[PDB]
């Protein structure tokens, strides 16, 4: 026969699968000690419901934030000012805490996490393509511009 899971078990038995099980489904193992199953008519009625409902909480991350790039990439660029001296070298450095707050005031409480930023830029005045991502499949390339107040 076959039964649900509650773990992974050597055999296709990932958390939540109803296939390839053996006679005397545990009751001496995979059910008592560790995971369990008692599939029945009522126990799948709820568990099986997990397929559908989980896909929702998992869809949103790919629903609202998926193409959300525009709301942070619709602009040709963001622009921040600072201080320089040479051919445009920013003394300290403006970056996450800056680009973020700025665009945050705009409508993006973006965090300095998945941001591809290879370095705290703005050190050089001008453009700077800084791509950011909120979700795994999500990301967006946005150029930034450095200016001196």
């Amino acid at each position: 026969m076959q039964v649900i899971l509650l773990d992974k078990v050597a055999n296709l038995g990932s958390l939540g699968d109803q296939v390839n099980v053996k006679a005397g489904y545990a009751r001496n193992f995979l059910v008592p000690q560790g995971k369990a199953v008692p599939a029945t008519k009522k126990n799948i009625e709820f568990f099986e419901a997990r397929r559908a409902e989980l896909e929702a909480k998992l869809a949103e991350v790919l629903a609202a934030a998926n193409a959300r790039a525009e709301k942070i990439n619709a602009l040709e660029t963001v622009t921040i000012a600072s201080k320089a001296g040479d051919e445009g070298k920013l003394f300290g450095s403006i970056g996450t805490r800056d680009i973020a707050d700025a665009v945050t005031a705009a409508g993006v409480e973006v965090a300095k996490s998945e941001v591809r930023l290879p370095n705290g830029v703005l050190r050089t005045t001008g453009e700077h393509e800084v791509s950011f991502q909120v979700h795994s499949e999500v990301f967006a390339k946005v150029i930034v511009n450095v200016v001196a107040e």
């Binding site: 009751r27 001496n28 008592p32 369990a36 008692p38 029945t40 008519k41």
Partner: protein
Amino acid sequence: MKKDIHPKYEEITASCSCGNVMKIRSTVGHDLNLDVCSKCHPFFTGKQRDVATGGRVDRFNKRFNIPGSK
């Protein structure tokens, strides 16, 4: 000997040499005994096999209730 769930035991029948005899026989069932409740502790019980299944079909726990009102 009475199988806790789906209670059964020593029914009597007779034999048959097909030729001659109708000596009385006698049945029994199956001894054996397991079970361990995942709602407290491993309570066990001696039950028949076709008696274990049944419990393990959709009781296992949803069945101790009858022994309550033994």
